[PDB]
Amino acid sequence: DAELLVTVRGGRLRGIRLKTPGGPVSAFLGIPFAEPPMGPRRFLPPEPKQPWSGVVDATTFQSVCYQYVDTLYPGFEGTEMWNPNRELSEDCLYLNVWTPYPRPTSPTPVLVWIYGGGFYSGASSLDVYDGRFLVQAERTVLVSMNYRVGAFGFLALPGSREAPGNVGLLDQRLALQWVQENVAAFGGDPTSVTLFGESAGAASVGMHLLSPPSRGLFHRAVLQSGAPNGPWATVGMGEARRRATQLAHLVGCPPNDTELVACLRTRPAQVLVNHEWHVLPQESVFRFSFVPVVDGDFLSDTPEALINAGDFHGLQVLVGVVKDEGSYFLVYGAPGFSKDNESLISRAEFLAGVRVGVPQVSDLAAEAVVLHYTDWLHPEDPARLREALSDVVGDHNVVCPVAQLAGRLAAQGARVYAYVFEHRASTLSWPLWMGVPHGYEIEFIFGIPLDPSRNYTAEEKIFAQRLMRYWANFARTGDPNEPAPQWPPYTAGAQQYVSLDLRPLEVRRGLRAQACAFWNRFLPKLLSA
């Protein structure tokens, strides 16, 4: 079958044909785009894959980059759907390509997916990132890569040449460079690449927006439940060096940078994973040890500084959030919370949870949060405290950082479309008090409901095809609308967004404008003084 045979620049590839309820697609899985960053190349920037002879087996997903594996609810589908479904290895820099069957003979718009996972986990092989449905239903080319996470991707000894940091981000950029030189061989159009990602993936997208070497490798961005400007996606040079130095102490290696990292390179990958989470300064939720570092190279400044100073005329972006972004993170450290529970916390637990949810800030800053999120007519209602604390970590970490990004880019040339995903899947295993948790719009954007092997309803499948068309319309034209209630662009003044559920589109104003004026306008003034 000649359709499964592609010659990229490194050599020849053999793909596989896959079935969907709407017809077949061509897939090429486990395409090597970098030399394996092992041994002496641990922590170093990625190197392009040297050419090979013969035919590369591109019929199965490759290995998952070494990462922590969640153990909180063993066997629970809500946690295991994000866990690795392939074996772990540092040899993990492969990407996957999905195109229609037979492969297009005309340039096709390309979508590049960057997975999330707090920069410590994730894999392009997860079932919920299956690109076969989007490609068949909307006739695009979908690409997805694996980038290093945790210490292997983002341990930085700033100023070092052996651990410069952000190497997980250059992994993504190298894949985007691979796209520009090779996607046309699959029928893709390298002059219409649309980045999209969720959570840390969405944050990774925005950082490519603000890094000029990456800007020439794609044309639009979709940021779902993530942003580069939040309080969790970046770290300073000094804190990055402290965390890298402590991890080395915890693994028995002596805190000279080059001998330090040389000793780290002698440690099995598993032992570094086992200690990465204990270099955090304080017991926290939504805080991660090894994230991108602001060191003047990849980002010449902090994301907020580059957002405020940038000219964004000629750029379209699609941004949004789920209804209850905070719900999911509080079962991982917030006092009194559990998924097998109503989690009707007390005031003591609420205030205790505020220091966990808003870590590393002064007492005054913490009390300011409590005042804004307390109903002083119902100061101790457990149901209200449960939802207020979810709003705290949800607004602080996702809703407000994204609302700021949307407002600034719109006011500075970019055309922005904003959504909030308000449908709770019928297959959701999480309790009802969590509502629509973080990350559970992805399965609908990838058309997972169309899989007849699953228990989604008829309306949900129609809903999935609605959002696939929205996303694909944006990739094709920079406008999600169908040329029906129209989706208006978000602006700093009107602050208009739409709600995505089984009902038709509903236009609303303000992404929690009151609560995010607190985080985006007042709090920064409070800490600097």
Ligand X SMILES: CCN(CC)/C(C)=N/[P@](C)(=O)OC
Ligand Y SMILES: *[C@@H]1O[C@H](CO[C@@H]2O[C@@H](C)[C@@H](O)[C@@H](O)[C@@H]2O)[C@@H](O[C@@H]2O[C@H](CO)[C@@H](O)[C@H](O)[C@H]2NC(C)=O)[C@H](O)[C@H]1NC(C)=O
Ligand Z SMILES: NC(=O)c1cc[n+](COC[n+]2ccccc2/C=N/O)cc1
Binding site for ligand X (CB under 6 A): 82, 116-118, 198-200, 328, 438-439
101 is in an annotated binding site: no
199 is in an annotated binding site: yes
Asked about 438 being catalytic, the answer comes back as: yes
Measured between alpha carbons, how far is 46 from 323 in angstroms, rounded to an integer? 37
Q: Of the residues 304, 372, 438, 460, which is catalytic?
A: 438
Q: Of the residues 138, 276, 304, 325, which is catalytic?
A: 325
Q: Which does 277 bind (CB under 5 to 8 A by kind): a copy of itself, ligand Z, ligand X, none?
A: ligand Z
Neighbours of 333 (CB within 10 A): 15
DSSP-derived pairing of the beta strands 316-322 and 220-224: parallel
Asked about 325 being catalytic, the answer comes back as: yes
129 is in an annotated binding site: yes
Residues 6+ apart with CB under 8 A from 233: 119, 200, 203, 207, 226, 227, 291, 292, 303
CA distances from 286 to 107, 115, 231, 263, 310 (A): 41, 17, 9, 30, 28
Q: Of the residues 121, 199, 284, 390, which is catalytic?
A: 199
Measured between alpha carbons, how far is 408 from 306 in angstroms, rounded to an integer? 11
Beta sheet of 12-14, edge-to-edge order: 5-7, 12-14, 55-57
Shortest gap between Cβ of 367 and a copy of itself (angstroms)? Answer: 6
Does the protein bind ligand Z through residue 121 (CB under 6 A)?
Answer: yes
> Closer CB to ligand X, residue 316 or residue 390?
390
Q: Give residue 447's region: left, alpha or beta (phi > 0; psi -120 to 50).
A: left
121 is in an annotated binding site: no
Among 344, 366, 428, 517, binds ligand Y (CB under 6 A): 344
Measured between alpha carbons, how far is 266 from 42 in angstroms, rounded to an integer? 10
211 is in an annotated binding site: no
Q: Which does 332 bind (CB under 5 to 8 A by kind): ligand Y, ligand X, ligand Z, none?
A: ligand Z
Shortest gap between Cβ of 352 and ligand Y (angstroms)? Answer: 9
Task: Give which of 234, 207, 232, 235 is closest to 221, Cα–Cα.
Answer: 207
The residue length of the chain stands at 529
Among 340, 364, 376, 432, binds ligand Y (CB under 6 A): 340
> Closer CB to a copy of itself, residue 264 or residue 511?
511
Q: Which does 426 bind (CB under 5 to 8 A by kind): ligand Y, ligand Z, ligand X, none?
A: none
Does the protein bind ligand Z through residue 288 (CB under 6 A)?
Answer: yes
Does the protein bind ligand Y through residue 335 (CB under 6 A)?
Answer: yes
Interface with a copy of itself (CB under 8 A) = 362, 364, 367-368, 371, 374-377, 495, 509-510, 513-514, 517-518, 521-522, 525-526, 529
- Residue 8: strand, helix, or coil: coil
Measured between alpha carbons, how far is 49 from 29 in angstroms, rounded to an integer? 16
| DSSP annotation string for 86-100 | S-B-S---EEEEEEE
Please, what is the angle between helix 237-250 and helix 257-264, to 10°?
A: 50
387 is in an annotated binding site: no
H or E element at residue 445: helix 442-445
Shortest gap between Cβ of 120 and ligand X (angstroms)? Answer: 8
> Closer CB to a copy of itself, residue 371 or residue 458?
371
Asked about 259 being catalytic, the answer comes back as: no
Q: Which does 200 bind (CB under 5 to 8 A by kind): ligand Y, ligand X, a copy of itself, none?
A: ligand X
Measured between alpha carbons, how far is 234 from 113 in angstroms, rounded to an integer? 20
Binding site for huperzine A, residues?
Answer: 82, 129, 328
Q: Which residues bind ligand Z (CB under 6 A)?
A: 68, 70, 118, 120-121, 150, 273, 276-277, 285-286, 288-289, 329, 332
Q: Which residues are catalytic?
A: 199, 325, 438
Binding site for huprine W, residues?
Answer: 118, 199, 430, 438
